[PDB]
Every structure is written in C-alpha cells, then in structure tokens.
Symmetry: D2
Subunit: 387 residues, 4 copies
C-alpha cells in the first residue's frame, strides 16, 4: 500500500495542457459548447464545469487530496473552517432538531452553536463528551447530531470518538468531528465511525499561515452532495488562489506533521519537568487524563497544547519575552505561535462555558512549529529563567 | 463635489510601507506587541488586526471603496454574492419571523429562500413587488424584512424601491436590495430608503470575469456590525487575492458602466426593431413596463437583459451561431455573454414560481459587454440571418 | 475596434474556462520520450518549461502581437529586459548603435555603461533631425534606437524618415513606444523592425506589475529575441501575465481618457501664469507637433512642464492632494515627479544638458480621474 | 548557534502592519513624502523604496533568507537561474577578459557562454575543472573569472572548488559557483572560497515546481551592488508573487533536503545493484570518482543524478513505464522527475561538448522527490522488470 506522502504528491486527475503543477483557474464562469451541453451540466449529466461557485477545477483538485487522506466519499472546500462547520451542521439540522456538542470547543464554534443555531429553532446542548454516559444522558428522541472536537481547542480534552459513534449509529444521529488540532495524518474520524470529518485548513493542512480555509469530508455520496448544496446557497467558497496554496502546503503535510508531533512532545516534556510549570495538557503525555483513548484512536499527536503557569503575571512574563515564538492567535503554522486563551481565542466565550471549559488566566497555549526543537526549548527556557 | 471616478482611484487610508498599490495581505494571522495589546484588540479597543476572518487589510480596503460609493455606514465583503445574501438576511431573520421577497429572483436566491429559510422556521412569501399594494396585502404582524432585486434577474422586472422603503419604515421592517444588475454607479438603494444594499461582486463591480465575491453595505453601524458578526461564524470570506482583484477591477467601474449602459441600450433597440424578436425586456426602453420608475430611481442601467424569440428552436439557433458573444452563465463581464434562463440560471426554480416569473423556453438573456457595439450587433445580425 | 480584438483573443479555452488560467508552473509533462524529444526540436505542439514558453504568458504575447501587427511578441520581467533583449540580441563587438539623445535614465545607463563594455560603439544624437542621423552614420552602423516622444521631454523623432534611412543602409530600427501605447503608436507600421514597451506603464495600466514586451516585424527577429531571452532570463511571471492581459482589456478605453485628460491638463498649464512652458506633443506650440500628429493616432498623458524656479516646483509637487509624488507613469491615477533628481538623476551631466533637463522641470502622468478634479488639485497647489 | 531551520522560519526584518506572513507587494511604484525624501532615496540616502525594479519589499525578504543561509554580504533575486547566471558573469566580464568555465554545464549555460559571451568580445574556454592542473594550464594574463557547477548537471562531475579558489585568489579572478544541484543546505560555496554563489531557485530552493527564479549571493558588498546595478539595466526580476512563493517553499527547505538526500542515496544504491543498470553517477556513492572531494566539501547531497542503461531502447522502456516518477525536465521538486539528457536538457549542446561531457543516449537522469522511498524504488523496480 502506497504511503500517504506519495498519494498527496500524486493526486488522481488529468494534467491540464500537460502542466506539471495544477493551474489556477482564476475564473468565475465556464463556456458551453451548445445549449444542450450546458442544460445537461445543470442537470448533472456529462463531465465539465459551469461556474466556480458550483465547482472550480483548482478547488476540486484540493478537495480530492483531502478526500484521499480522509478515506471519504467526497470533500468540500470552504472560505474558512467556520464555513466548513456551518455547512456541516446547518446543511442537516432544522427547526425542532437537537444537537449535542462538546462543551470545550473553539470560541466561534461556541458562538455559532449558542447564538445562531437556537435562532433557527435548533436545540443545542453543550455536554462533556469525554464521558460517553453524559452523552447518552443528554440524548433525546429528536437528537439528530453529535458534534465533537478532540483533542479540544484549547485544553486538549479527549473524547471517545469510537464509543460515541456507536450510540450515534444505533440511534440515527450523524457524528461530526472537527479534527483540526490533529490533522488527517494522525486522526481519521471516518475510520472511527464519524459521518463527517472537518478541518480548519487555515491551520496544519495548509501549514504556512497564509490562507484561511476549511474543508469537510463525508462518508456517503449523499451527505457530501447535501453539504455542497448548502454551500451553493450559503456561499463560503475557497478562492482558486487559496486552493492552489492549500494544495501546495499539503504536499508537505506528512513530513511537517512528523516534525510537529516530535517537537511538540519534546517541548511538552521539557515544560512538564520545569519548576515554573504547574501542569501540561498534551494528550501524548502519560500524565494526561484521556491519554489512553488518544493513543488508541489516533496515530500521532498535533503540536498545539496548553500549560499552566503559577500566575497570570508569570504567564505574561513568559509570553512577552520570547524571541523565537510569536505572540499571535492561530496554530498549525511552520513557525511556533503562543497565545493567552483567557484574554484571546476564548475571551468571547460565556463565563458559564469558560468555567466548564477549565480556562483560567494562568493558562498559555503554544502551537509548536518545525524549528529545531532545541532552539524552541532554549527560547522558552531563557524566558522562564528571566530576572 | 469630487467625482466617483476620482474617489475610487483615491481610497481613504494610509499607504503601507509607502507602496503605491495596496499590498496583498496573504496572511491568516497578525502578531501582537504584548498580551495587553492583543487582549485590547479582542475587546475592540485600539487599532490593529488579529486574524483575517475577523478583518484583513486588503479586504477592508475593498470594503471601504464600496462603502464610499453606497453612502453606507460600513460594508462587508464575502466569498460570493450568495454569501452576502445569506449573511444579509439570516443575520437578522430568526424562527417565527416573516420575509416578503420579490417573485423574480436569481435562481440560487430562490433556492435559499424556498429551501433553507423555512427549515430555520422563517416564513417566506414570494410576491409581485412591482405593485406596492401587493406588498401591503402580503404584510403580517411578524413581517421583519422585504428583500428585492430591481431590475430582477432575469426578466428585468422593476420594483418601486422608494415606495416600498416607506412601507418598511412605517411598519418596522428592514428593506434589503440586491443591486447586482445595475451596479452602485447607477443604483444606490440606501439613497432610496433601503437598509441594506448588496451585490454579487462577481458581476459588474469586479467586471473581469475572474473572481467570485459578494458585498453588503448597511445604512447603520449596528446593522453592519451584525452582518460581520454573522460572517465571523458563517465563514463566507473574500480571499486577500480576490479583494486585490476586485479593488483593481473597481478602479475602472465608472467608465465600464458608461459603456455597458450605452452598449446595452443600442443592442436592445436593435433587437426590439428586428422582425425575429417578439419583445425586449430592457428597463431603459420606453416600451418596458416599469421604465418610468427605473428612470426616476436609477441614474443609469446595467446591460443585462432578456428578449423573446418565436420558438425554442429559434433561440437555440441564435445562441449557438454567435461568433463574438459567448454561451455561458454569469453577467457584467467585459465581454458579451449569452444564456438560456429556462434551462440554465433558473433551471432549478419550481414550476409554479417559474410561471409566476414568466420564464419560458423562448427567452434568451444577454449581458452586453464593452466591445464595440457594432461588433455585437453584427454578430447578432449575422446569427438571426441563418 | 481594438477593444473587441483584445476581449476576444485567438486560441482555445482551457478546460472550457472563460478567463484564461494562470499556469503557475515551472515544468510540463511529456507523453513519451519521442514527444519530449520532438518538442525540443520544435516539432509538434506543446510546452516544455516556462522559461521556453508558458501558456499564460503566450496569451499576453499574442494580444500585443495582434495590436502591433507583428510576426510575434516576447514578454519580459521589465521594460529594461525588453530593451536589453531587443538590442543585445543583435548587436556585437565591432557594431555601432545610433540612439536618441533623450531616453529613459536606465536606457542611458544600459547604452552608456554596459554596451561599450561589450565592444559596441554608441553615439547618442538628436534624432528629431534626420540629417543628424545620416551624419552620425558609419560603415559599421547596425541599429538605430529611438524613444518618441522621449522620456521625459517628449522630444519627437521622425520614425518613418529614419526607417527609410535604416532600410536603405542595412540597419535595424528599434522603437520604444512606452509613452504612447500601441493604441496610438504602431512603429512596425511606420517601418520599424522592432517595437517595445515597458508594460509596467500604460499597457498594464494599474501600477501593480513590472513587465516588458518586444514585438518584431519578422519571424526570424522574434526568434532571435526569444533565443536571447532563453539565456538572459528576463521572464514575465505567469501571475504578472494574467494581470497584464487583464489590464489590457481596458487599454483602449483608458487611453482615450488619458489622451483627453492629458490635453486638457496641458492646456490649463500652458495658460497658467506660473508655468513657463508645457512640453506636450499634442499642443500646437510644441516643436515636432506636426510629425507626432502625422505618425501617431493619439497621445499619451505623460509630459513635462517648466516652473519658474526649483523652489516653485518643490512647492507645487509637495502640496497636491490627489496627484501622488512617485516615479513611473501610465497608471490609472495621476503621478508627478522631478526628473532632474529622480528618473534622470544618474544621467551624466553632459547627456543631461543635451537632453535639456533642469531643476525647473516637473513631469506629470495624468490618470483617468475626472479632469476637473485633477485641474482643481493643480490649481490649489499653484495658487496657495 | 541557532539551526538553519529556525533561521529560515524567523528572518530578520520588521513585520508589515503586524502581519504574520510577509505581504505581497504587488506594486510597480512607491510614494515619496517630499521631493527631498525621494531625491535622497535615489542617492542611496535614508531607508525606503522607490520602484520594484530597484527594490521590492517581498523580493528583498526572500533575498535576506538566501543571504542568511549563504553567509553572504547580500543576495539578488532574478526572474530565472539564467537571469542569475547572466547577471553574475556579464556584470563583471567585459571585452578583452577571459573566462574559464567547467566543460559540463547546464545546456543554456553552455549556450550563454558559447554563443553570447564571444559576441561581446569575451574569451571563453570550457575546461575539465575536476583537474586543478588543467585549470592552471588554461590560465592567461587576462583571466578574470572561473565559473563552476559542481556536481555538474547532469553527470554529477565534481570539481575541487577549494583548490580552484586558491588559484583564483592568488591571481585576481572571481570564482563563481552554481550550487543549484545541491542547495545551500549542503553546499556553501562562499565558505569554500567562492566570490559568488548562485542557484536556479526553480529547483530545490522553491521546491514546489511552480516558480521559475534565480538568486545570486556575493561575498562582498561591492560585488552584490554591481550585480544589482546590472539587474537594474538588464531587467531579470523576480515578481512579487513569485518571491512570496519562493520564500514560502524555502520555509521547508532544510527538511525537504534531508529527505531528498536520504531518498536519493537509497535509490542510487538500489539502481547500482540492479542487473539492468550499467553505472550510477551519484556523488555520494563510494564508486563515484570525486566522491572523496564531494564528501569533504559538501555537508550532504542533492537527489538529482544520472544512471546508464544498457541501451537507448532500455532507457525509453524504463522512462515510459513509471507510475510515480513523471517524465519531464527540471529537478529538485517535491515529486520525482525523470528525463533523457541526450534528447532533452542537453539536446542543444554542440556535439564536441556532448562528447567532452560524456552524455550518451543510454543515460537517464532522475530527480528523486520526497515520496516514500520504497514507493519510488518499487516503481523503478516494476518498470525495470517488465516483460
Ligand atoms: C479567535 S481567532 C483564531 C483562530 C483559531 N482557531 C480556529 C479553528 C476553527 C475555525 O477555522 P477558521 O479560522 O474559520 O479557518 C475551527 N476549528 C478549530 C479547532 C479551530 O482551532 C485559534 O487560534 O484558536
Ligand atoms: C446559475 S449561475 C450564474 C450566476 C448568476 N447570477 C448570480 C447572482 C447572485 C449570486 O452571486 P454569486 O454567484 O454568489 O457571486 C446574486 N444576485 C444576482 C442578481 C445574481 O444574478 C447569473 O448568471 O444569473
Ligand atoms: C527611474 S524608475 C521609474 C520608471 C520609469 N520609466 C521606465 C521606462 C522603461 C523601463 O521599464 P521598466 O521600468 O523596466 O518596466 C522603458 N522605457 C521607457 C520609455 C520608460 O519610461 C519612469 O518613471 O520614467
Ligand atoms: C529545465 C531546467 C534544468 N536546469 C536548469 C538549471 C539552471 C537554469 O535555471 P532556470 O531554469 O533559468 O531557473 C541553472 N543551473 C542549473 C544547474 C540548472 O540545472 C534542467 O536540467 O532540467
């Protein structure tokens, strides 16, 4: 069986005009040969293109690469991870439906689920999905979907994706998994029983900190068709240039992830043994609750994780005196980023949910890049040992 | 009174690193000076950027350009006209609300209002908005929005935006106008009393057929903040490169529109007097119902319009023997496009709505470009002779 | 008209795409050894490697070629790349070049510093007078190189008359028509062998690309130019060619506006008490107007005018609110510069005097803004 | 000392408008504050920009990255490797000067030195530079430059860069080295005594097969200023978009080269032991002449090399029956390329020079990518073992 490195470098499809790199189809529309040919494409008959919102060759090339690593029936690219998330939930959920979602989610996902979904008559509970019994207890006759992020942003809380998938499968609910934090090299939710696997491509998949985009992949042709139908009307599109950039970043995804995984673990171990650090939430550490599940259900770890300092002042002093790490939000970039969730990525999260998420002023999140790991550790060490 | 040509070519804002052209900020994230500075930005305090989904300087420069021409409090750019439409309606409407929309709308707008909105518990009635009395009769206690396209895609049906805005003002509803077909050079819905004006930037605004994008502009600061809050979560973003291309295309928008307008009128009059053509639906023709309203409420016309052949066979002959015009959906490009609405742009609209729209297999939609008109007419004359 | 031709270029669509795709690629795949071998021998149809040929760049080349009436066109990474490729592809040690005495600063640098290092004799002379061209002629003269109207003074050379001299005497005539665009000046139509442009100016028109183009009357000459380019390596990037082709779609319409704005502005300046003299080729007062009127079908909107002192020029250039102080020209928005300390600052003193470039001169490149707004900007800056 | 991976990911310079990724300055011109500020910039006084041909911020960012890895006084980026080679030779050589260049060079370099330089009154000899004594024997009173490619394209012939540099330094000649085949990760000619080190950035540096570009770096400020002065008039520029892409590709250069090097050596060893293969020219093999010089003077190897089949027909059969390798010219891409030098990259090389270079119809050149090496080897093996 051919390695994923090779698969990503050799995607299926004809070359265009013998071009080795796939061209950028910076076009809005496409030409018809005849009234019939154009009519037929609008009915889904024949091969070809109509209009970039319905399908653009460069974006489709990126979709096929993701589809190939997810093992999906199809993938849909979007203008952002939030586009993928809206389109993977609201394409299916309608008034009177019930959604169970993790209680520790990316801030704007909490915003979408707690502000917008209830306005559309959709019932939403945020539940601790690290415990399958709590998921079952929150289940209702109208539950149509469970939505999980695991490991969760930013605390890395692990959910039992396989265990929850069994209950979804028995009860007729879709299981949707945001695998952004781990990448499809290491977490393949469709292999664990999910119906839909999605990512912010803005993070690891693209990897170069220069594109916002999203992708969603479905286990069935019907589900990916419905998602694309929603996309056509909701309009979160990946631009041709951004698709060219995402496909290009993904060409190095397997080797970047290997380096991220190993750097991340080494940085977490360094932090865990350091006297200034109270606790390290990296799901690859034996000390981490849920390490046993992550180890079984994933084939590696991402390199974004959280650690606890002794105070807010210690956290600030660390974050502001680094020379290699960059103070900024986002994650999954080739270079190391660091931020303060309580006052940044999660500052818009309701106090109620903040308290249950376990997010405090002492926490710092680091997204470890592919720099030489000793250089990253020496940067953290000099800031930690400051006068 | 500085002219709009000059305004578009001289947008407000600082140069970046003294660059003459505005740089393409192909970035996802921005760096913070300190914890406090990043925290302040997240609370909307101070000046700066955080992350391109929240705000990208290249995208914002294009937003400022549109905002100036619309006379708006602010503008939001999107990944498509459908992103703008979605974000300008679903940012406000919620379960139990009622929407009144024009009966003649772009096909996917029909799909949005007719398939997705009701799944979200929003009641929707499509009605003939060319008669303000029919809008009044359709009104309900829970009516929160009227949504109009004028002239409508593809029949060019005209609504009294001004009269309808009075009714919305009186009865506590937002008026949203899709002004894609006319461009903001010739139609400024916020000057007519609308609350929101939006475009498929994919059409005239960009004008070069190489970008898909949307823009929406609101009369009030609170409404544009809501639109952008919805955009934050829904995620239809204009890419930095596309914003660079849309701003660049918009630099020639006023001259392109002058030519489109003059060209489309000349073509329509040629077709109207030709023996093979049953009727021509251009809002700038004296024969067109709604001409009197379009002339008073607009300062010009787009060049996309519809005409009727004597049979489907005839329309097919004409569409397939043109050498200059290109058979393709979309409109408002520098070159001439031609389309068959029944089986293309409006193929998916339900039979009953299609009947109400007056769309038949005999209709052909042309989007007249900025070619020498004599070439477009000769191309048409050529084909009609076969 | 020209607009229809530029909007409907010849060629096939790629994958039915309406906009021509951006071939952001270095290399192309071969179907077999034989097919790749054949392409390297110039047999069959297809591509090998973007330096030899890129489809997006070739589409832009074909657009310029059609408008110039050429046998072919070559795109480059800058106007300087087109210039050095249209001259050094032909001239060799022992050859002599006659060049206009007033040229863009970097062309002066090329001809004055580099060409003589390569054993090429160069005389800069006043090409507004054909007898001076004849008098400078030598048995080893192989090329005349003209800019008309010249940058920055707008000095006009008789292209047609010089072409007759060149044809009779076995020399190539190369014309840089940057200042006028191919809508208005078509040197190959006047007898020239090669016509070239800084695409960075009018042709692109949007101030966001640097590029060059050269067009040759003969198939053999464009082959030589591309052969030189293959080894010298000044290429137009596929993204820049996409942008250039895109800007060119509005070229004829922009040029009509530039021309009309520029004339109205020159006329305003010419009757202003603060202005000594306006060098615009379309003015009746300008020496060489009669040639320019006969050999061109319009005018660009870049031209020079004379203030009463350096201090006055500085005051004018530093109080404009619409016009931007920057080098370059032919952009949609109005640009203004000081040739003596900017574009022409490195020109040797003696060539400078021969050019007539003094610290009292300001060069303006009138954009497509409403002319009344640009006149009001100049007006307040001249009077307050 | 900080690792090169870290340096490339953290290049010196201020961020622009706090942007994490460096913006694309798609501009021709820049604005002046005043006539004095503009006048000064033209005199080289003060900080700022004028016009992209003279200096573009995005291009300068990429130049700084190369300069940092070369250990140079400065770097200049170009529209192509050939722009870099032209500008690194013709910026210095004039009529009456003499150039000694290697006899095995990239085809278009042979075209430049053999067709264009003599037209400009520059004397050129192509010499076997793998023998320092032959270089000395070719020396004349007017010799001003030696130009080397090592390992040479496509035979991998190795020159003694250090030994030749001694002779250049004693006699007042510049040494110019095209290090395209090896990359600046493994070959740093300025540390071996070269005055100028240059690359086709089109190959490894960019790495992604989607840009043509060049770069040249000089040991002295004076020489890089002269190179840029030439560039200003000859006009081979790197476009702002291309510079953004080259900088982006270069963020993964160290990890890509590590994999290229390891894959290329394993493929060479596989080929060297295979019955169908007559000889393998990879400078990292102990069997290769000049292996001892390459191993002392480089810190690794590129993964483009040539091998000899038993016949032209055998080469064609191999080249036309691969599923992973792509038949195409160029090299140094993430995916594996293969070509036939005799009829492709070197088909324009004059017969006498071909014979001097040792290029025959039996030779195949492979540029090994970063695919899983076992997939690459299995692809070659199945083609070699065809019916
Ligand atoms: C507060 S601003 C920083 C962005 C960010 N996270 C993003 C993200 C998204 C959304 O993806 P989009 O940004 O729309 O491509 C979806 N799902 C997950 C697990 C995510 O981590 C962060 O820094 O924690
Ligand atoms: C059937 S496919 C051709 C697209 C098309 N029209 C689009 C359009 C949109 C949507 O804008 P987006 O396409 O999302 O940028 C919004 N509003 C109006 C009046 C529109 O006409 C057409 O060819 O009639
Ligand atoms: C001092 S820097 C400003 C650039 C400039 N002129 C350029 C130019 C070129 C060169 O074109 P490239 O810049 O290489 O695309 C060629 N030919 C002509 C008639 C030109 O005017 C100027 O502002 O006068
Ligand atoms: C198709 C190109 C091949 N080579 C190129 C090359 C260049 C020239 O570099 P641009 O191509 O001008 O960037 C310079 N120096 C070296 C050692 C090279 O290999 C090839 O062999 O396959």
């Amino acid at each position: 069986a051919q390695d994923i490195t090779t698969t990503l470098l050799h995607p299926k499809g004809d070359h265009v005009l013998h071009s080795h790199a796939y061209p950028i189809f910076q076009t809005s529309t496409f030409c018809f040969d005849s009234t019939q040919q154009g009519a037929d494409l609008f009915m889904g008959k024949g091969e070809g293109h109509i209009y970039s919102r319905l399908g653009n060759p460069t974006v489709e090339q990126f979709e096929e690469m993701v589809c190939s690593i997810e093992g999906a029936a199809g993938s849909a690219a979007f203008g952002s991870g939030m586009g993928a998330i809206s389109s993977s939930t609201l394409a299916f959920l309608q008034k009177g439906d019930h959604l169970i979602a993790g209680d520790t989610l990316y801030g704007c996902t909490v915003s979408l689920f707690t502000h917008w979904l209830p306005r559309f008559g959709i019932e939403v509970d945020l539940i601790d999905t690290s415990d399958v019994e709590k998921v079952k207890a929150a289940w209702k006759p109208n539950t149509k979907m469970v939505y999980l992020e695991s490991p969760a942003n930013p605390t890395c809380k692990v959910s039992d994706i396989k265990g929850i998938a069994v209950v979804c499968h028995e009860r007729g609910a879709r299981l949707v998994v945001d695998a952004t934090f781990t990448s499809p090299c290491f977490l393949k939710p469709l292999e664990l029983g999910a119906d839909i696997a999605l990512h912010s491509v803005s993070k690891y998949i693209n990897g170069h900190g220069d594109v916002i985009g999203g992708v969603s992949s479905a286990k069935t042709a019907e589900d990916i068709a419905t998602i694309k139908f929603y996309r056509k009307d909701a309009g979160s599109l990946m631009a041709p240039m951004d698709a060219f950039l995402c496909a290009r970043g993904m060409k190095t995804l397997p080797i970047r992830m290997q380096i991220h995984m190993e750097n991340g673990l080494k940085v977490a171990k360094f932090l865990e043994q350091h006297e200034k650090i109270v606790k390290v939430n990296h799901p690859g550490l034996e000390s981490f609750p849920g390490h046993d599940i992550a180890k079984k259900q994933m084939t590696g770890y991402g390199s974004t994780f959280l650690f606890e300092m002794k105070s807010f002042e210690a956290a600030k002093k660390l974050m502001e005196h680094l020379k290699v790490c960059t103070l900024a939000v986002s994650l999954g970039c080739v270079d190391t980023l660091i931020e303060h969730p309580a006052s940044m990525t999660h500052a818009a999260v309701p106090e109620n949910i903040m308290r249950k998420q376990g997010i405090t002023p002492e926490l710092v999140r680091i997204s470890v890049g592919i720099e030489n790991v000793d250089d990253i550790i020496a940067d953290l060490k000099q800031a930690l040992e400051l006068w």
